[PDB]
């Protein structure tokens, strides 16, 4: 299938084992902002669901399918690849909705769906929006979408901003300097210090932070799910030019994302920005290998290049320079193995 | 085709050896001062067991235990490591000018060739509850390289079990499961999934420490002798009979382990008991879905059954009974999915 | 047949009036100084509503409220009491030299024959949650004896309800029911009865007091005007509510208290059982949800508290509450006759 | 029926409503001395149950019937008059025992059994053994017992002993002296002080105590449940002659009870004595109206007369005198309404 061709089997085994736990579904469901916003986006746009045919890509426990049912959908196809599909079926029966929701166990790239649908709903966002590569599954499902059907969410915006965090940068060396000693129980460890530094700097940091560390207005990269093809997500080239609002040392780039549900009645936004209540996506920070000094009014330009890999994630190549001075740095990070600092 | 790959799902082995490829994770184990200092003491204080000997280090990681064997006078040390950490170990061997004593051998101990038989095997193969990760079986397998009267460091392993009371922990886990009792979560009746949620949460062994006053009986001991055991020794049946010292609710069983290095100069013990300074193994508690009441003087009897699985862990079955009343508790746990409290 | 007997199971009534025959229970009410001092102040400070008037005391107990009416100058006081406490009231009337003014009439107010119409009725008919015991219906029934110009002391009653958070109370009740989850109690599997046990323990309203900081929204008020209400008005009591949540968290149930006002010609005097006021022997009352509701500050919590009178001198309570922003609902049935006295 | 003729309807309704609560069944089941001793008595005498026919009088949740099944019984008829019969039936089904336990809802005086039984099991003991009058239902059930059938429990012993407790005695007057004041909010309450004293003294005290308050060795009255008839329990006369071990003031008589399960293999005892761990029966104390001084070596002689009443309890009359001086005291008590003093 399309999925097997792009995914290492060992990655997929761990991935769907993770989503097979009720405790993991619960942690998503108890994200009030996440769950409440999906509900309002569906219910408040009821004319997008009443008497419609719906596809739910990666339905988990089924919660979003039940919302589409609350909004009056005539028939909902709920596709789920993990063993959570058996629990969703239990809930469809116990909620007396077997006439309106059919759970289809399997990957959306592999199952057979009988008819075209009016609207696709899904929650395919990962860290920095793109982690997990589920957005490609969501776009792949548009083979089942009628012309002039809709997508919920309709667009995804990933945001990037430069930050200063002296304590985060210095902490990498505090940890790595464990190895910089001549007699750890009699052993000189210091030949491994550089390798330890490199290992730490390749990890994106998942945690949150005070918005006062941000040094410029973010730059936005928009994916329009109604128009994009899954091939568009294999190599994501994000140019940036930041107009610095504050003077100081820039230690890296911070990432968050928004999605918008563009319905016939209204548009509803779900934001994971650090100005908004915290979600289970937190935010993501990638360090430069060396800080760059920038003055307020300088411009910080470069590119963030996301290169998809077969571990359902991306290699992150960042390059940046202060235009008015020529100072430049870079880094290359492995998004599959972030450091959870929160 | 090897013993390892026959008993191990590929996906599990990938994550396992990737985890141990991180320098940060070697640092974490190395900074366990009780663990690292105790291993050094067991080896240096039994220096006569290493002096001019041939050594095998099973799963050497950064190489730290091989360096201890070199300090103790070993003539040659084969340091076997299957993760990419083997490359970092070789860097340290060169930088410490021990290329004449420590020889790194990349690969699984079930698959590599050694030039000669060895006088003693060293390893740190203990996981949570002693047996997690199934590395003890690699340690035992390595005895194919051991001369007839060779030694093993560690030599024996003791698992300890004991009933405990802890209402707070019980209700902390019940409360999480109660989420799946709601008849109307955003309008959706979840309650049909409530038994499946209880089952899932209570299958998680709880890893953390606790005050010793929560133990309701003296612990029962189960001993594995690494000089004698075979790696097939896969299905572990631990019977127990506790003489209760206090009355109250028995919420589950607590587990810890000790290993002893039985050297020619002295026996050195590394203990993870709750009476001892904390280690990165902490302790493990397996909860009952429903607590049993017993009084002082009663006997609590049963069996802890550990079945090894292909994910490098164990399926745990605990059945316990208050002999005086016939009150019985039967519980299942997945040592692969612990809850780190 | 009497109106009382037609609405009351004999077994309930026998136990009810036996309870009130004990001097120790009269002492308990009398030693509630907020209650007794507030009644005395309502009567004496509105003495012109009693001077040279004819008074009916409904359910007089030991007679204390009739003595207050006599202190305020009432010409004649008919003190009606159905328990055996009536005989002790007669003793106090004689020993306080008030035989010319206080006339004990033993029996139910629905069944006695009163000698004449009265200017004012006094009573203490409030139970837990105001409505327990159904004695408000006897109070209203007694208006058959009230002159057109007449007054009622108390004159109105306000019931207050508000959402609360209290995980400890919830866990306490849930832990008791968990006994019936056991798969092997002395070798017996009890767990088929777990749902029945939860239902039973959560049917009990909790009578005790609490810190006002557990309250998550301003209370909603429901008023009964004793001058205007008819007996039959209290057979079905429907209290709608819409709360504006002031705090985020779990709503474990609704809290209840009540105030009564004595609206006299000189002043209005209030007796409050609110948790902001000194404790009384009515305490406060909390009805738990089997399933707590999560709400955010600014959300609305809406629904209905419905009280249906029953033949055991109490009410079957149904509470349905819903968080409007999410459609999360909780439905609960409670048996007001049999509370859990937690204090 | 025999039951309805001896029981006021109102008492019966309240009584079986009480036992219809799972929480009350849980209270009894959690009494570990009670429940464990019954289980030991049945299981350790397994030859009295193996392949036998059993009747469980007042089975409640069914717990004792499950113990009989554990001991090998072929058939158990489990009779229960409260709505708890519905819950027991649920447990019989969920424990896969419908082929061996037959729940029969109703009063044992009124249901029909399809055959005679080898052994009757029951827990009919109330406060100081006799409260609730359920021993009569247990004895009534012998109409279903085969000749040389057995009873578990087989005998019951009530123990009586004189006690000294100055603080318990004085406490009655502290409470009653609430009424001895001339102006409680303007009212002279004093005329009711005597009636308040009398009311307190009529209540047996349920709580526990230190065994050193006991002034003489106990006297024992035995009911043999194999031989006794219902009528024997309507008038229970217990004479006593205490030989005083300590000098001091005797303030009343203390009561407790033991039962014995006299099986083919061994006899097992369940004791509620103050020398044994506490049960939910505690102990019971009946004050004298006036204390009696006795010296060590004196004799305290008298009678405790228990008269059954139609509220499922007893009127207690106690008369006692110190033989060497003639000093005499008495008291009349209502066992139905004890004072629960325990904390
Ligand atoms: N809601 C969330 N909560 C979170 O915590 N995160 C962060 C998780 O970050 C991780 C990082 C590394 C690893 Br490794 C694992 C997680 C992300 C989301 C959004 N994702 C919704 C997932 C549902 O979609 C299903 N699903 C996926 N692909 C499918 C397909 N092709 N066909 C069919 N069903 C498919 C999958 O089984 C699950 O039910
Ligand atoms: N003041 C209070 N303080 C409290 O704490 N509570 C808590 C109640 O707790 C209870 C516990 C168990 C049971 Br069961 C019942 C209640 C309640 C009240 C209000 N109750 C005053 C009743 C007086 O009025 C009499 N009475 C009633 N109906 C009559 C009629 N129809 N005709 C004539 N006399 C009638 C009744 O005999 C008694 O003297
Ligand atoms: N079958 C096997 N063959 C070779 N190495 C193995 C193995 N199974 C596990 N290992 C390795 O054994 C190590 C266990 S951690 C112990 C590290 C080191 N000996 C120290 O004390 O610091 C890991 O590095 C893991 O990669
Ligand atoms: N005449 C009668 N007929 C049937 N049941 C009766 C009865 N009189 C009392 N009972 C019942 O007897 C029980 C006594 S309590 C004992 C309950 C249970 N056998 C146990 O040991 O735990 C109550 O449940 C009560 O409802």
Swiss-Prot record, chain D:
Protein localization: Nucleus; Cytoplasm; Chromosome
Disulfide bonds: none
GO biological process, one term: regulation of intracellular estrogen receptor signaling pathway
Coiled coil feature spans: none
Superkingdom of the source species: Eukaryota
PTM summary: Phosphorylation at Ser-82 is strongly increased during mitosis, and decreases rapidly to a very low, basal level after entry into the G1 phase of the cell cycle. Phosphorylation at Ser-82 interferes with S-adenosyl-L-methionine binding and strongly reduces methyltransferase activity. Phosphorylation at Ser-82 may promote cytosolic location.
Consequence of changing residue 82 to C/T: Loss of S-adenosyl-L-methionine binding. Loss of protein methyltransferase activity
Phosphoserine found at: 82
Segments of this protein annotated with the region Required for nuclear translocation: 212-245
Sites of the Glycyl lysine isopeptide (Lys-Gly) (interchain with G-Cter in ubiquitin) crosslink: 93
Statement: the UniProt record of this protein carries the keyword S-adenosyl-L-methionine: yes
Binding residues for S-adenosyl-L-methionine: 25, 34, 58, 80, 109, 137
Entry similarity comment: Belongs to the class I-like SAM-binding methyltransferase superfamily. Protein arginine N-methyltransferase family.
Official protein name in the record: Histone-arginine methyltransferase CARM1
Record gene name: Carm1
